[PDB]
């Protein structure tokens, strides 16, 4: 018998991740990403600051 | 009454077997069929061999 070969991009699990190639991975001491999220505001009066 | 002859190939039981003729069947000692089956393999990390 001959095996069937599975490719990862053909699977439906590939829409759970975004892959990217990175050759110098062993030289990374620490990698970070940043988020800058701002929130809306309500307006009201009365006995509140 | 005339007897109704039955042929084996018209029956639906012939789909469960493949038939072949062999005139020199009385001179066999041990016929042998052979199989070669391979299996796939997955890759992991951590404390697994």
Q: Is A39 on the interface with B (CB under 8 A)?
A: no
How far is residue B41's CA from residue B49's CA, in Å, rounded to a whole number? 13
How far is residue B14's CA from residue B17's CA, in Å, rounded to a whole number? 6
Find how far residue A7's CA is from the centre of its chain. Answer: 22
- Which residues, including other chains, have CB under 8 Å from residue A8's CB and lie 6 or more apart? A14
* Residue numbers in B near A3 (CB within 8 A): 38, 40
- The reply to whether residue A1 touches residue B38, judged by beta carbons under 8 angstroms, is yes
Question: In the 8-state DSSP scheme, what is residue B17?
Answer: -
Find how far residue A46's CA is from the centre of its chain. Answer: 43
Question: In the 8-state DSSP scheme, what is residue B14?
Answer: G
């Amino acid at each position: 018998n001959t095996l069937n070969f599975v490719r990862f991009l053909e699977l439906g699990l590939s829409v759970a991740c975004i892959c990217t190639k990175f050759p110098e991975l062993a030289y990374v001491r620490d990698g970070v990403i940043q988020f800058e999220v701002q929130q809306p505001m309500i307006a009201r009066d009365g006995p509140h600051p």
